[PDB]
Every structure is written in C-alpha cells, then in structure tokens.
Design a protein that fits this description.
This is part of a larger assembly, with 1 copy of chain A, 4 copies of chain B, 1 copy of chain D and 1 copy of chain G. Chain A is built from 26 helices and 53 strands. By secondary structure, chain B is an alpha+beta fold. Chain B contains 4 helices and 5 strands; from the N terminus they run αβββαααββ. By secondary structure, chain D is mainly α. Chain D is built from 9 helices and 2 strands, in the order H-H-H-H-E-E-H-H-H-H-H. In chain D, helix 2 packs across helix 4, helix 3 crosses helix 4 and helix 6 packs across helix 8. The longest helix of chain D is centred in the N-terminal third of the chain and has 20 residues. The termini of chain D are far apart. By secondary structure, chain G is mainly beta. Chain G has a two-stranded antiparallel ribbon. The termini of chain G are far apart. Classes of the chains: A alpha+beta, B alpha+beta, D mainly alpha, G mainly beta. Chains in contact: A-B, A-D, A-E, A-G, B-D, B-E, B-F, B-G, C-F, D-E, D-G, E-G. At the D-E interface, loops of D face loops of E. Zinc ion binds next to loops of chain E. It is classed as transcription/dna. Keywords: initiation, closed clamp, open promoter complex, TRANSCRIPTION-DNA complex. Mycobacterium tuberculosis RNAP open promoter complex with RbpA/CarD and AP3 promoter. Chain A is DNA-directed RNA polymerase subunit beta.
Chain lengths: 1111, 147, 92, 176, 102, 49, 54
C-alpha cells in the first residue's frame, strides 16, 4: 500500500518487507543536484558525512583556483557558482526546440601580487543544461538521457600470472591513476624485480629507490628480509643517486640533453607535481584503504607520496613472500592479498554528475591555457576577469558532450517501462571505458559481488551481453561512486531493523543470510543451520549465531523490469533475459487494460516513471476535461494540470494522457490522477489479457508462430496509434530563394485539392504513399532543352517553367491522417539556422490494426510472429461457446524451460473465474499459510505474486480445484487445468483435454510495415555506382560474400554474373536491361562492373602499373 | 628473394624511388554538394593539397636560394606528405583531421573489411530486390512460396 | 582450427621415430624418454616432456622396456602433423 | 607575422577564399562572437549589417561563404561501420525510366511526324533540329528546299495547326 | 590492351611503375592547391579539378562555352583549353605532379 | 622456397635433359592461411588478407 | 533533415551520339623545349595560338 489511490491488488507474499522500494530515479536526480549543490543535497550530505559539503562545480573551481602566470606577480581565482532561473519552461523548450538550460554565474577574482588589488566580478560562465523533474535533459527540443558508466577505479591492483616455461608465481602491480602516467612493479622470470615506469623498457627497484634518494643502507633497512630485494640491491650495478637519475632521464627523455636540475625535477614532475598527475578522491581513498596508510585523516594531496610508493614495493615483495598481513609504519596493518578487477569493490560507477564534471574540467583546462596565455600578453593595470575569461571553449565542451557522445543517448520512450529502464542503466562501454573489440570474455560474466548491486538477468542479447546492465531495485550509490546495498543487521541472533548500507568490501568482510528464512516473529531464527554467503561467493550452512547481516527482502538481486515478471523463479535465465529485454519493447495500445496476474512492481514503477500526472497536494476536483484538470487545494489555491494529448514519442508512438478522476472526487497528495500511455488506474499495462490455449493447431502455430482470433482485429484489442513527423525547410540558394507555394509545376489540379492556399495540406486530409504534403518549388536556371521536349512545348504552348519542383512528398508505403501542422517562419523572427527562410513540420498519424507477421510475446521470453488471423468461427471454442483468442504451441514449452507461462496461464484462469476455498471445516491443508481474503475471490479480480515469494504449486492446485462456475452450473476447467475444446472448423470435440487460461501478452515494436521493403530501380551511390542502402532510401539487400559462395556451390554462373554486373554496377548496362524488359526483347550481354574500374584507377594511383592484356 | 625477383623480370628497380606522383581522377574523389551548400570533399583532396603546397614551397625555396636547414626540412616535409598520401598512419603519428579523426589515404581504400575488395568488389547491393518478415505457410506446396 | 592451421598443438605429445624398447626415466620434476634403436644408430632423446602430461595407454599404460612402433605416440595429447609428416610420410 | 597570416589565409580552407573576404569573414566572426559575449544572444543579419556598415544580403553571402565542407569519410552511425559517402543519392545519375520514356517518345514522335506528308515533316525536323541537333532556321530551310522563307513559315504554321488537332496529339499529351 | 575495357581478357599483369609510365598516363600537370572558385562554384584552372586536365563537367561543352553540341567533338577549344567530349572522362583521366625533389 | 609439386616434377623432366641434375624436394604440410596466400593469382591473394 | 541527395557541379546532357559527320577540324603540332612533340586537334576556323601549355 502506502500509495493512496492504488488499485486493490491482493498479494501472495508470505513475508513482509521492512524497507520500501526507494526513489527509483535517485541515481539520476541526486547525482545532478550533487553537481549543482542544491540545498536538498546540502542537507542530505549534512545528514550523512557533514564535514565537506561541496558541489561538483565548487570542486572544479577550487582545483582551478588560483591561476598564476610564470612570473608569479598576478593571480586569478574563482568562487561561488550560482544559477539563475531557467529561461523557458519545459514544454516551451520542447516545442520551440530550445535546449532547457539555465545560466551560470561565477564570481571571478583577479589579484595582482606586486601592487596589490582584487578585481572581483560576476562573470557569465554559460548556459548550463538542466535536468528535468523526470531525470532527463532536453537538448535542442529532443530529450536525452546520460547513461551511468561503469569503469575501474583508480588505485593499486595486484595479481600474478603463472609461467609455464618456469612454473613460478609472478606477482605484479599496476598503480593506475586518473590522467597520469602508469608505473608497474613486476617480478620477472628470474628472481629480480623490474619497475617499468611509463610503458618503457623495465627496471630494477634500486634505481628508483636511489632516484627518490634512498641510500643502499636505507634499502637494506627497509628491505632486510626480502631475498629478491637484497638480490637486486646486489645486482644494482649503479651507485650514486644522481647516477640513477641520469639513467632514468635517458630512458625517459630519449632524445634530450640531460642535466642535474632537470632529472631532479622531472621525476618529481610525473608523480608529485600534481598538474600532470592526479589520482582522484576515489584513488586516494582506495590506496589509503588498501595499504592502510591513513585511517581517520581526510582525503587531500591527490598526488602520490614516497611513503605510498615504498609501501607498494614492500607489499608486493611480501606478496611474493607469501605473507598474510603487513603492517606499514604510521598505519594500521592490512591483509596481504591479490585483487580482482571485476569485483564491485574495484569497479566504480561514474554517474552523470561525475561525467558532466569531467567535461567541465576538460573545458576549464582549455579556458585556462588561453587565460594564462593572455595573462602575460595583456598589459598590466588595464585588465579584468571580463577581459581574461573566455567562455567559448567552456560552452563548447558541454555542447559536445550533450550532443554527439555515446553516453548522451537518445531517450528511448516507447513505453514508461523503457523510459524508466533507459535510466538506471549501467554501461561499461564509452570514452574511458572498454570497447567491444577490446572486451574480453571475463568482464562479461557475473562476479558474485553483483548480488544486490546489479541484476544478473537483464542485459541486451545482442553483442553487448554483460557490457550493458541495469541497477538493482534497492541499490543506492556510494558518494565515491560505488554501489551500496541495504542489509538488515542482526545482533546475537536477533534480527533488528537497523538498515545499514554496505558496499562490496563489507559484503566480503561479514556474512549474509537469506530473507526467506524462518524468523520466529521476534527477530529470532528458528533452525540453527542457516544458508549464508561467505566472501568468495561460497554458500555454506553457518550455525545461526555468526549471522550478522540478513537481506532486506527477496527479489533484491533483480532489476526493475525483471521484477515485473510473475513466476520468474520458475523460468530459465535465457528466456527470462529475453522476457526482460522484450518487456521494454511493447507499444502503447489504445485501450491499455491492466494485467490480472502481476507483481508488486506495476504500481510503483509506474508512478515513479514520470509519465503519470500525480496530484501534487491534496484537495478536491473542480473541473475536468480531456485536456486539463483544475484541482482545488484545501487552502485557497487552484492549479491546472495540463495533459499531453497525442504527442509523438521518440519512437513514433502515442503519448496520450487521459484523466481518471471525476468532478467531485477528493484527491490526496501522491495519488495517480491521470493515466499515461501504458498505464491503467495507476499501474502498468503493457498489453492485454487474452484467452490462450496450448494445442498445436493445423501447423499455423508451427515453430514459435502464433495464431489469433479475428476478435482482436474487430474489437481493437491490439491496436497502436503511430505518429510520424515529416519535415521540410525552405532555404536560400545560389540562384535565388525557395518558396513554399501552390504554384507547382506539371501537376494536375487533382492532387492540389488537399493543399491549402499557401502550401501545406489541410488538417485531417488522409494521405497515401506518394502524395504531396508541402508545395515547395526551387529555381533551376537555364538548361537547353532536348529538341523533342522543345517541340512538345511548341505544340502545346506550355512555357519553359524555369522553377523546379522539390516538394515534400510522403514516402513510400505510408499513409494515415494528418494531426497537426507546426510551421515556423523568418517573418515571425523565430530561431532558424543560417540561410533558412521558412520551416514547417507536418505530423502524420495512422492507426495500425494487428496483422499477420507482427511480433507478439508474453512476459516469459516466448516471442513469436503472428502466423494467421483466423475468423472467429474456426477457432477452438469452449463448451460455453467462448472462443479462445490466441493459440500457442506446445513444442516450444518443454525444451525452452519456461513453464512460468504455464503457471501464469493457470493462475490467470483462476483469477478470471474467481475462486472460493470453502473453509467449512477448518482450512484445507494447502491454504493454511495463505493470507486472509484469498480464501475467496471475485471474477476479474486482480491478484499478484511477488517474484521470489509467490504462488506455490500446491497453492495453485488448491485454487484450481475450486473455481466457481460462470453463469450456469459449469466448471469449464477441471482440477488438472484443462478443458474439452470443440473444433470450430470441423466440429468434432478434441479427444483430449487442452490447457486454457488467461495469459498477459504484449505487442512488440517489430511491426511488418516497418520492415517490408522492395526496390526495382531507385537511388544510386555516389563514388561507386552500387544501389544505395536501407529502408530510408530504397536500396537493395547486400548480396554478400557468403551468398556468392552459395551460388558458386550450386554452379549458377549466369545468375552470379547478373547479380554482380547488370543489377549493381554495369552502368551502361542497367538502362539497356530496363529498356529491353519494357520492349520485351532479350536481356543484353553484361559488361564490366564499375567497381572493378574504380579498383583499376586506385591501383594506378598507387604507382602500380596495372594493365589488361589481350593475348 | 627480392634480388632475383628484380633480376628475372624486366623491372628496373629505379621505380622504388618516385619522381612524379599521379592523381586519381576527380569523380573518384568527388566534391559533391548537398542540398544547402554544405559540401562533401573526399578526404584525398586535403592530402593532395598538402603535397601541392609543400612541393610549391620547395620549388620557391630552391628558386630563391635558401640555406640547407630550411631546404632539408622542406624535403622531409615533402617525404612525410607523400607518405601520408600513400599510407596515412603507417609511419609515426597518423595525420588527423577535424575532431581528431585519422584521414583515409589510398592504402586505407583497400585494407581491411572496408576496402574495395570485401565491401564493393565481392558483395554488392542489388536491384530487383526486397525483404520482409516471414511466417509459416502450411498450405503451400513444396515448390511454392508466399509473396 | 589448430588442425587446419597446422599449428603446433598445446598438449604436444611427441611420437616415435624408430621401433625398439624405451629408455624411460623420470628426471627432475618432469620426464626423460629416449628410443633404443634396433639396427642401431643414434638414440633419439626426448628431454623436456612435462610431468603435467600423461603417458599413452593402449590395449595397458606405457611401461618401461615396451616395444614401440616407428611412429608410436609416446605421451598423451595431440601430435603435431609436421612431425608425423616427416616420420611417416604423406599417407599417414 | 604577415607571411604566416598570408599563407594561413591561402592554405587553411579547402576551397580557396581570397584574403579580403577572409578578413571580412574574420571581422564578422569577431563581431558576432563579442556580441554573443555581451548580449548573450546570437544576433540577426540586420544587426550585423548595421554593425559592419554593410548590407544584409552581403551578410547572408558572407554567411554562405564561411562554411567549411564536411568530409565523406566520417562515421555516419553512432558506431563506426559505414561512411557518409555510402548514403548520398547521385542526383545526376541516369534515372533509367526517363531514358526509356525518352526513347519511346522519339519512336512515337517519328511515327506521328511520318503520318504527315514529306515536305511537312522535313520542315518540322529541320525547324526543330530532330535530324542532327542543329536547329535550322527559316532561310536555311527555304534554301535547302529552294523556296522563299514566307512559304516555309506558311508550311510551318499549317503543320503546327495540324499537330494541335487532338487526333495527332492524344498519343503525345501524356508525355508532359 | 583494351583501354575502354571491352570484355576480352587473358591476363592482368601488375607491375612496378616508372616515372616515364606516370607522366605518360597523365593528361596534364596539376600545379595549384585549388579546387573550386568559392563564388561561382566552377573548377579552377591547373587545380585539382581543372577541366583542361581532367575533362568537362558538362556533356559536350567547353569551359568558355564557345562549343556546345556533339558536332564539335574530339576537338579542343583554342581559348579555354578544355577538350569537348562526354563528361564521364572525369571518371577516368588522370593527372600527375612533377616533384621538385625525389 | 615452396613450389607446387607439378611444377617441380615438370622442371625436373625438363632439366634431366640438357645435362642432368635433380632438385631435391621434400613434402611439406602447410597451414591454410599460408596455402591461400601463396597462390598463383595475385588478385585472389590480394582480395583475401 | 534533407535529404540526402547531392549533385556533381555539372550538367549531364543526352543527345544522339552520332559519328558519321562532325565539324571538320585540323591537327596542330606544338613542341616543348626538350624535344617533346604533342598533337592538338583544333577546329578549322580557329585562330591557332603560338604557344600552348602541353
Ligand atoms: Zn571554353
């Protein structure tokens, strides 16, 4: 509950969750207000670690301040980032294609050292894009989501590889900073220790130790026990610290005259002078925790230190020694261990605040080089930070992040579930991250630290399996970019309620129980032998005294979309993965009926999805319409909630919002007030409830194919509204200026009936493929005519008509009405790009029926195209004359391991008909641990099973046993779950009872009309002369190399000659072929292809004498 | 191997150094305009402009009389220009464009999956073609099909 | 793929070169196998055979003094096709 | 500094722009940029024309001259597997249906011109160049037939009156 | 062998080319780093697109426009220098650059 | 160097006349990359890899 | 936005590709300094220039 206008959906949950589902968009919103420094963030950080409340801009402007010239006689500083309000609201920016932004004001400060002044201003820094309420950015009117990125946190990493030539463990380290230079301390095949510094030809340690300034006695003092260290100290072959420094410099300035002051400073440059080396806050905390240098000390001095380097060397050589723990002087001891680089204690999360902060840092560097350039060339006693600061490279970096970056992704909103699930997305690829060709197989697996931090199910099934994921339900982001997870701490076998967020390191320290454990209503466990998880992913039976943490609920491991699959724990992970990736692809139907059988996650993940209007503060309804709702608050004020009717989504689907309240209803705050696209009375509705049967019927449901009734076509059950945006601009040109007008050229005044008086069509005129939308004509100039055309103009008297018509024609294979015509103009002084006079967009919409070939699927990965839409009479009907609606196949069920669809089918029939456990003499044995008000149910009553605590199979048999009759005395579905179907076509009853029920299926966005394509002769490519590519043009299909092999293997030589000469490249041959077809002659003999001749001239361009020889 | 290769044929080995560089025809490196004046060069034009600029600068330096450092620097620049023309990215840093995109030289028109061989010589887009989604046809004959 | 590429395999098990009884020896942490010729001639010595491998079992395990073939596979694993070409010709 | 700015004006752009137009492009860029720093909004053509004491059509022509070309060898998709050059319709290629329509036009037109007499069709073919592509005029036609040019114009008007009759025109009306 | 490449083939003989082959392939000597006049959108003389070196951009028209029909073909306009022919010789005609140093 | 067997035998048949000497040949078993690249036609071997 | 389609900067005409008669034309011979001969077909009624870039 805890949501006021919820539907009453009864749950099968045997347990109780202490913790609610959190604020599902916090991973976006709290990160962005962390970047700004919003006061809600300010007080939350004061709640949780108060000592350093700093926004991201304050961090960048502090690490920038001050900026001094090389003279050191003047300095420039920054302070106090501050916004104005936004310059235009959300809907106006989305309409007029403005980016929804707000200005940055920065108090700069220029100080001269020698004379002594301050020059303080308030510099306009730039218009900064602003996250909306829904966690999205609006760039150029389009809507964009910045996806969170997984990358490996900077620190010190330890591993060893075995050497099959030698069979020795070879330990190593990679001290990876952020934007610095690496250094690695290996132990090679011999018993020495190369210290390769910055990618170039190894090293022993002693050169580096003396290069920092350690004497040989200090080396033996720090490394006495270490046999490899004393061996390399005896094999040092260089005495003198500067004698090591010169080697050093020669190996790192190869091509430079060395001197003592340069190698003294350049080693201090790469690792200690922090302008060229910065392991970040995360890196400093990670190193200081791994080596245990500082414990209570705050995080500062983001370069390295000599203590950290010698502690790295000592830890590595004791790691080769096979030590267990190591104490460093000045710090508490740490365990000596190697490090996985896949464990979530090492694989951090650069969220959206971190990403925009990095782009602002790389912008401020480009600003800063310009500033300290003109800090010298400008004359002193004349300049000011208005004259110093250049904001143009700053604003350019933000605009080239939000535009054209593979994390500034286009908002994938074809339903509220995918709208939510394109947020909360973890993507391990991007700039600074690994690409797919660089991707090994070991990063794509599921390490056992993912439990509760990242869902193992949901990942795209293409070539991205494991590189792209999604956050868990309960997961929450550590301020250092790690993924914390709630846990219920349990003290002395008493399960408390203190919820403590632990990251993956303390998940390994401690031990973790299960939520489906027998808690004896007091915090006490029942049986002593309890399931638990140890550090390395091991599963044990601990006695029930060492358990110090327990999970907050079941379904904790799983994502948002995957937790909307009922009976998920029965399905195999492959088909559950397919179901989670296809539940995000449903289209918004015109009716959107709620599912019978569900989870808990249909209501919460709909009111948190944003696309449902929510009553902000309580009160009573004044005035409803189809367009607005005016609430009356309890204190005087009123407020109009405008709808969004028939707005085009980002993938062409409808986005209607109709209200669900009446004019006298009282609403409370946080109530659903208006359904969205795929919602129904608050909760998600991705499809409809259809009567299913599981027989194989007449080969039309053969190999995943699906048949349907015609009732779905007649009653508009599966029917989606699609809205398409067409666009043309009237731009300038060299010859003159274009013009949107009705004076088009040669075109019967028949097709100029739909067009208005000044170009564009009238609203509501139905169009077909090839019709005129925008009458728009360009000048052409003077080209001399062909004489036949000249005499045709001489006979008919029609003039030359020097203008040439490029009208906006609606492309091939499309039709439908015209909803709305948005027109811009230069004459209204609208923002148009250079050389454009008039812009107009025409929105075309059609209403697609469901049709054979369209892609349908349930909630279990059981996809399948529509084989045949039969009539309603030749469909297997029940004994009550009710026909079934779809018919799935049997043979896809047992071999794909997804009987969640069968359990959903039986429970759906139970919820459709309604049960009544007649508890006359006590409660029956199955129904003992059922909740109350499940002993009886109504027809079409909504139920819900949560994911990992749902309907047991004995409970399904118990419900299916008593399933009260429809209108007569008729139990249509017996205790087995089957029924006697009659054949609609022939007429005889089927000799065996067949499973029927109500299954909840979706309409996927792989419609036939988006896929069918044909080309006889169309556009052609430019340099080569092949036909073009893709359904946007005509294009042909690539008769690729393997198909050439196939037709060689048949031996079809002539068809191969056809398909490679006179259908693709024989430039003079194609028109002869077309002419000979029309005239009915023979096809001519093919000539040389064109791409061979292009190859010939390229080879002659590479100074290779290539020639064809006759004989 | 290579000595007897140059011996057996009628190939003088004088062609391994180069004195006159040839230019690919204009339609194979076309400068097409889009609708709206945003032109489209073909990325070889810039390499030929680099070679033509550096050659003309060398010619004026030799005509004017220049010291040895400037002339040898210019000949090294000419060498690197021709090297970038025949294979950018081979020797040293690849010559970038805007956005730091390495350019496409003549060797990159043939190498790899996107050369002329694997992309346009063997597998071509064809006319008289089409695709669609498929469905099961259990009333068809074996030699029939839907369309 | 490594068969068609004619690679040297990972688990390389060397084959015989001439018949005779075997000179078996377990050296330091790996093996040492040598063929005793029958004419005779030079003994073919196979030194660097890992103890991570196994000896070839047939009919019983490879015991010392057992009479090997001309191209009998000595250890267990994968024979390289180059060596069986050089020993037993194109047919084999 | 002069030599560097001179050669930078010569050798930086693909299409060459001479130095005076480069200077007024740089002045327009600096003015529009500083007005973007001061106003905060990108200014208008009439504002820039008033500011640089020039005409707004000259501002439009400079704005057309400023734009550098985009290359044919960048990655069109969000990943790199196709170039921009593989997605441009060659709008001067042979359309392959107008060619066969033009050949059918020529065949039908020769048939309709053969429906008349011989002097008439010869006058039409020479008047409109249908035999060589060289459009002969009235004096050349009257010379090669040995009559006066007014007789040629009479025959021309009579035949072009004959052709406008729809029985000689229904088979040609669809060819526009 | 065939230069317009009718389909009669027996061999395809590659070979390392010489400078006397290269300046015999060419029809001109490109010597300016210019492509197109910025204002008229016509190709420059002695540039990378010169119609004298590489052939006409327009079917049977010279550069100065003094010849505009098929009846003038195979000939060269004595002022502009552009050989009047079909405009697909820009697909095939090559040019060369005389370098100042090897 | 690696040459084809038929060319090898035909060369020995030519050179047993005009003074007799055999070129000594041994069979090789080469992988399929090197076999495809050491073909007679440069066009296929250029188009392959 | 639009579209994509592009054009080479030039017209493509189509007339009769006749070969039987043409405009009659001369052949002139120009010579470089280094003994190179070149033949240039000029038209008949054409003022032949004295020097020519070969
Ligand atoms: Zn001319």
């Amino acid at each position: 509950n805890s949501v006021p206008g919820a539907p009453n959906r009864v749950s099968f949950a045997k347990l109780r969750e202490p913790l609610e589902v959190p604020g599902l968009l916090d991973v976006q919103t709290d990160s962005f207000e962390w970047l700004i420094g919003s006061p809600r963030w300010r007080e939350s950080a004061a709640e949780r670690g108060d000592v350093n409340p700093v926004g991201g801009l304050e961090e960048v402007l502090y690490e920038l301040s001050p900026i001094e010239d090389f003279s050191g006689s003047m300095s420039l500083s920054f302070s106090d980032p501050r916004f104005d309000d936004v310059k235009a609201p959300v809907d106006e920016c989305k309409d007029k294609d403005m980016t929804y932004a707000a200005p940055l004001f920065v108090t700069a400060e220029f100080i001269n050292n020698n004379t002594g002044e301050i020059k303080s201003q308030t510099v306009f820094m730039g218009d900064f894009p602003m996250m909306t309420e829904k966690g999205t950015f609006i760039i150029n009117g389009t809507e964009r989501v910045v996806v969170s990125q997984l990358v490996r946190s900077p620190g010190v990493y330890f591993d060893e590889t075995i050497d099959k030539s030698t069979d020795k463990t070879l330990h190593s380290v990679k001290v990876i900073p952020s934007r610095g230079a690496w250094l690695e301390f290996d132990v090679d095949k011999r018993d020495t220790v190369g210290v390769r510094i910055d990618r170039k030809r190894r090293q022993p340690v002693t050169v580096l130790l003396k290069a920092l300034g350690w004497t040989s006695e200090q080396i033996v003092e720090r490394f006495g026990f270490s046999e490899i260290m004393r061996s390399t100290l005896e094999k040092d072959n260089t005495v003198g610290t500067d004698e090591a420094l010169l080697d050093i410099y020669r190996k790192l300035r190869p091509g430079e005259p060395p001197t003592k002051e340069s190698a003294q400073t350049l080693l201090e440059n790469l690792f200690f002078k922090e302008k060229r080396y910065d392991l970040a806050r995360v890196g400093r905390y990670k190193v200081n925790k791994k080596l245990g240098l500082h414990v209570g000390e705050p995080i500062t001095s983001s370069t390295l230190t000599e203590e950290d380097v010698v502690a790295t060397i000592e830890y590595l050589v004791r790691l080769h020694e096979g030590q267990t723990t190591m104490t460093v002087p000045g710090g508490v001891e740490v365990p000596v261990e190697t490090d996985d680089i896949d464990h979530f204690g090492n694989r951090r999360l650069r969220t959206v605040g971190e990403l925009i902060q990095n782009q602002i840092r790389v912008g401020m560097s480009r600003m800063e080089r310009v500033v300290r350039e003109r800090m010298t060339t400008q004359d002193v006693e004349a300049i000011t930070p208005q004259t110093l600061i250049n904001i143009r490279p700053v604003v350019a970096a933000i605009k080239e992040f939000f535009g054209t970056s593979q994390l500034s992704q286009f908002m994938d909103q074809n339903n509220p579930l995918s709208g939510l699930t394109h947020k909360r997305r973890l993507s391990a690829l991007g700039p600074g991250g690994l690409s797919r060709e660089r991707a090994g197989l070991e990063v794509r697996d599921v390490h056992p630290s993912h439990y509760g931090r990242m869902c193992p199910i949901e990942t795209p099934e293409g070539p991205n399996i494991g590189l792209i994921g999604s956050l868990s339900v309960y997961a929450r982001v550590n301020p250092f970019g790690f993924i914390e997870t709630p846990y219920r701490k349990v003290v002395d076998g008493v399960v408390s309620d203190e919820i403590v967020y632990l990251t993956a390191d303390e998940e390994d320290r401690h031990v973790v129980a299960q939520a489906n454990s027998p808690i004896d209503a007091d915090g006490r466990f029942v049986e002593p032998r309890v399931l638990v998880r140890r550090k390395a992913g091991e599963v044990e039976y601990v006695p029930s005294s060492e358990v110090d943490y327990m999970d907050v609920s079941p379904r904790q491991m799983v994502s948002v979309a995957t937790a909307m699959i009922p009976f998920l724990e029965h399905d195999d992970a492959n088909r559950a993965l397919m179901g989670a990736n296809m539940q995000r692809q449903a289209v918004p139907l015109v009716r959107s009926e709620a599912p019978l059988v569900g989870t808990g996650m249909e209501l919460r993940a709909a009111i948190d999805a944003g696309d449902v209007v929510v009553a902000e503060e309580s009160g009573v309804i004044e005035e409803v319409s189809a367009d607005y709702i005016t609430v009356m608050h309890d204190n005087g004020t009123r407020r109009t909630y405008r709808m969004r009717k028939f707005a085009r989504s980002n993938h062409g689907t409808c986005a209607n919002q109709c209200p669900i309240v009446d004019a006298g209803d009282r609403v409370e705050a946080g109530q659903v007030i208006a359904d969205g696209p795929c919602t129904d009375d608050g909760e998600m509705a991705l499809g409809k409830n259809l009567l299913v049967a599981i027989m194989p019927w007449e080969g039309h449901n053969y190999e995943d194919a699906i048949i349907l009734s015609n009732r779905l076509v007649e009653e508009d059950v599966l029917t989606s509204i699609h809205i398409e945006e067409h666009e043309i601009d009237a731009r300038d040109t060299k010859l003159g200026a274009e013009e949107i007008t009705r004076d088009i050229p040669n075109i019967s005044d028949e097709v100029l009936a739909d067009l208005d008086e000044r170009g564009i069509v009238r609203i509501g005129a139905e169009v077909r493929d090839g019709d005129i939308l925008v009458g728009k004509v360009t000048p052409k100039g003077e080209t001399e005519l062909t004489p036949e055309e000249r005499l045709l103009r001489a006979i008919f008297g029609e003039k030359a008509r020097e203008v040439r018509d490029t009208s906006l024609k609606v492309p091939h294979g499309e039709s439908g009405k015209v909803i709305g015509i948005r027109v811009f103009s230069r004459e209204d002084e609208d923002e148009l790009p250079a050389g454009v006079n008039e812009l107009v967009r025409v929105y075309v919409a059609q209403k697609r029926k469901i049709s054979d070939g369209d892609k349908l699927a349930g909630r279990h990965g059981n996809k399948g195209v529509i084989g045949k839409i039969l009539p309603v009479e030749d469909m297997p009907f029940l004994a009550d004359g009710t026909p079934v609606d779809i018919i799935l196949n049997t043979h896809g069920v047992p071999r794909r391991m997804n009987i969640g669809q069968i359990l959903e089918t039986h429970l759906g029939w139970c919820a459709h008909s309604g049960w009544k456990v007649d508890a006359a003499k006590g409660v029956p044995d199955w129904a003992a641990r059922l909740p109350d008000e499940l002993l009886e149910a109504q027809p079409n009553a909504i139920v819900s099973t949560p994911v990992f605590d749902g309907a047991q199979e004995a409970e399904l048999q118990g419900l299916l046993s008593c399933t009260l009759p429809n209108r007569d005395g008729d139990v249509l579905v017996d205790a087995d779950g089957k029924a006697m179907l009659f054949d609609g076509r022939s007429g005889e009853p089927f000799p065996y009872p067949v499973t029927v029920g109500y299954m909840y299926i979706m309409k996927l966005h792989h419609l036939v009309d988006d896929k069918i394509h044909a080309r006889s002769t169309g556009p052609y490519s430019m340099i080569t002369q092949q036909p073009l590519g893709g359904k946007a043009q005509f294009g042909g299909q690539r008769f690729g190399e393997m198909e050439c092999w196939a037709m060689q293997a048949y031996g079809a030589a002539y068809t191969l000659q056809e398909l490679l000469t006179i259908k693709s490249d024989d430039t003079v041959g194609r028109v002869k072929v077309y002419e000979a077809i029309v005239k009915g002659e023979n096809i001519p003999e093919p000539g040389i292809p064109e791409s061979f001749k292009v190859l010939l001239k390229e080879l002659q361009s590479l100074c290779l004498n290539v020639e064809v020889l006759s004989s | 191997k290579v000595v007897a290769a140059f011996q057996q044929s009628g190939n003088s080995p004088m062609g391994m150094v180069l004195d006159a560089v040839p230019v690919i025809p204009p339609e194979l490196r076309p400068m097409v305009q889009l609708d709206g004046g945003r032109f489209a060069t073909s990325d070889l034009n810039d390499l030929y402009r680099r070679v033509i600029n550096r050659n003309n600068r060398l010619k004026r330096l030799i005509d004017l009389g220049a010291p040895e450092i400037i002339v040898n620097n210019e000949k090294r620049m000419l060498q690197e220009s021709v090297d970038a023309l025949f294979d950018n990215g081979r020797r040293g840093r690849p010559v970038t464009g805007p956005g730091n995109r390495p350019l496409k030289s003549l060797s990159d028109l043939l190498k790899g999956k996107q050369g002329r061989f694997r992309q346009n010589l063997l597998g071509k887009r064809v006319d008289y073609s089409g695709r669609s989604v498929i469905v099961v046809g259990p009333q068809l004959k074996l030699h029939q099909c839907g369309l | 793929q490594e068969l068609f590429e004619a690679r040297v395999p990972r688990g390389k098990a060397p084959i015989a070169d001439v018949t005779g009884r075997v000179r078996l020896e377990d050296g330091e942490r790996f093996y040492k196998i040598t063929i005793v010729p029958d004419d005779g001639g030079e003994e073919v010595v196979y030194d660097k055979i890992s103890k991570r491998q196994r000896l070839r079992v047939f009919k019983r395990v490879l015991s010392d003094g057992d009479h090997v073939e001309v191209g009998q596979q000595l250890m267990e694993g994968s024979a390289d096709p180059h060596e069986v070409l050089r020993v037993q010709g194109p047919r084999e | 500094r002069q030599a560097i700015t001179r050669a930078m004006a010569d050798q930086a752009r693909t299409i060459r722009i001479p130095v005076h137009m480069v200077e007024v492009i740089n002045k327009l860029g600096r003015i529009q940029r500083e007005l973007l720093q001061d106003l905060g909004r990108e200014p208008t053509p009439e504002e820039l024309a008033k500011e640089m004491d020039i005409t707004p059509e000259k501002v439009l022509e400079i704005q057309q001259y400023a734009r550098e070309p985009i290359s044919l060898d960048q990655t069109i998709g969000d990943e790199g597997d196709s170039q921009l050059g593989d997605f441009i319709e060659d709008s001067e290629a042979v359309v392959a249906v107008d060619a066969v329509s033009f050949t059918l036009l020529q065949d039908q037109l020769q048939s309709v011109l053969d429906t008349l007499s011989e002097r008439e069709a010869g006058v039409v073919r020479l008047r409109f160049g249908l035999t060589d592509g060289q459009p002969r005029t009235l004096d050349e036609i009257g010379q090669v037939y040995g009559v006066t040019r007014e007789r040629i114009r009479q025959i021309e008007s009579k035949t072009m009156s004959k052709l406008r009759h729809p029985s000689r025109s229904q088979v040609l009306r669809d060819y526009l | 062998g065939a230069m317009l490449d009718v389909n009669f083939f027996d061999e395809l003989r590659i070979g390392l080319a010489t400078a006397e082959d290269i300046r015999q392939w060419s029809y001109g000597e490109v010597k300016k780093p210019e492509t197109i006049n910025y204002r008229t959108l016509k190709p420059e003389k002695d540039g990378l697109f010169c119609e004298k070196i590489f052939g006409p951009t327009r079917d049977w028209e010279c550069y100065c426009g003094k010849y505009k029909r098929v009846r003038f073909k195979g000939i060269i306009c004595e002022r502009c220098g552009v050989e009047v022919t079909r405009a697909k010789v820009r697909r095939e005609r090559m040019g060369h650059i005389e370098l100042a140093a090897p | 160097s690696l040459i084809d067997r038929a060319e090898f035998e035909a060369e020995n048949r030519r050179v047993v006349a005009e003074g007799g000497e055999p070129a000594a040949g041994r069979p090789v078993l080469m992988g399929i990359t090197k076999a495809s690249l050491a073909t007679d036609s440069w066009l296929s071997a250029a188009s392959f890899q | 936005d639009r579209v994509l389609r592009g054009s080479r900067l030039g017209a493509v005409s189509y007339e009769t590709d006749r070969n039987h008669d043409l405009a009659p034309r001369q052949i002139a011979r120009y010579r470089t300094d280094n003994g190179e001969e070149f033949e240039v077909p000029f038209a008949d009624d054409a003022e032949i220039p004295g020097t020519w870039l070969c």
